[PDB]
Design a binder for this molecule. Structure first.
Ligand SMILES: Nc1ncnc2c1ncn2[C@@H]1O[C@H](COP(=O)(O)O)[C@@H](O)[C@H]1O
Ligand SMILES: [Mg+2]
Ligand code: NA
Length: 317
């Protein structure tokens, strides 16, 4: 009823993944960047991490399906070229296996055993040379069992990991053998809360979080940061609350944006719901289709915050 094996695999490959991303970042970023048709960026690093991880997962657990962000549908010839080369540093795949590996990420989730991957979470914070994450989780019937977040730029480079029921833990990117426990903060007044949110204005409503926090009488200004590294701040007590605020009722959050962090905050003693206080349902596919937005906190302040968020956002459509 424990998942030691799934968890040892994830720490192993998230840690290499981090080596892969730091080394991709050693070069100029432009000639390594693609603009998806939807306008979002994706880099040589995303494809390299996802090729390596799907390969390692598929070798070790031949029956599990993978849900991951990227695919090869369209991926320019010269980017692919560089992926290939970054990949062969860590495994012997020919350009063939690499494409096949990246394309294993097409599972629709739901029943059974699924791995959930963000090869680079917050790709923009990666071009920004600021916060970003390799995000891996393992679930069964939409219940998260293992979550790993590797964050090469946060406070020196840190890896946090949790399996269900067994607590939360922090590692250096350099040593995944020696970890420490990790518990959310004990902050009991919302006026003393440090709150966090995305840097991008398209990913969260920063005008309304201002309103919410001003009502909660928050003194300090938001720390704006990219990626699931926001869940990792909640979990280690560096931040108090984390808001992700929608502008409509039609955006559905991707499960590779939330699943690893979700379990890590809960194991470290906090609470994660949506903006109406409902628990996240990871069993309805590739997105959290029965949820609207995110509230992640240290548990102490959750309902107090949710009440004010419900209200500032009762007009979504
Ligand atoms: N309209 C949107 N609302 C919320 N999240 C989004 C939206 N569009 C894209 N995203 C996701 O936000 C993630 C990055 O969030 P962040 O790093 O917090 O800015 C990406 O992985 C996107 O999938
Ligand atoms: Mg990404
Ligand atoms: Na992402």
């Amino acid at each position: 009823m424990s998942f030691d094996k799934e968890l040892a695999l994830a720490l192993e490959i998230v840690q290499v993944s981090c080596k892969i991303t730091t080394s991709v970042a050693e070069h100029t970023l432009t000639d390594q960047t693609q603009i998806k048709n939807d306008k979002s960026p994706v880099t040589v690093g995303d494809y390299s991490v996802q090729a390596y991880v799907n390969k390692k997962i598929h070798e070790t657990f031949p029956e599990d399906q993978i849900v991951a962000e990227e695919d090869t549908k369209t991926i320019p010839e010269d980017i692919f070229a560089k992926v290939c080369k970054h990949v062969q540093i860590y495994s012997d795949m020919k350009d063939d296996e690499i494409r096949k590996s990246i394309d294993l990420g097409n599972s629709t989730g739901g029943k059974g055993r699924h791995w959930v991957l963000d090869p680079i979470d917050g790709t923009l914070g990666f071009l920004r040379r600021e916060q970003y994450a390799v995000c891996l989780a393992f679930m069964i019937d939409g219940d998260i069992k293992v979550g790993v977040l590797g964050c090469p730029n946060f406070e020196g480079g840190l890896i946090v990991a949790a399996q269900k029921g067994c607590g939360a833990k922090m590692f250096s990117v350099n040593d995944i053998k020696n970890g420490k426990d990790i518990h959310v903060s004990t902050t009991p007044k919302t006026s003393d809360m440090c709150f966090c949110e995305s840097v991008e204005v398209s990913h969260t409503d920063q005008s309304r979080s201002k309103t919410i926090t001003e009502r909660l009488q928050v003194t300090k200004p938001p720390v704006r940061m990219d990626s699931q590294c926001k869940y990792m701040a909640i979990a280690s007590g560096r931040a108090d609350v984390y808001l992700r605020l929608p502008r409509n009722l039609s955006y559905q959050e991707k499960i590779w944006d939330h699943a690893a962090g979700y379990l890590i905050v809960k194991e470290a003693g906090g609470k994660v719901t949506d903006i109406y206080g409902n628990d996240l349902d990871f069993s309805l596919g590739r997105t959290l289709c029965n949820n609207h937005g995110i509230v992640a906190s240290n548990g102490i302040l959750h309902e107090e915050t949710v009440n004010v968020v419900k209200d500032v956002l009762s007009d979504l459509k």
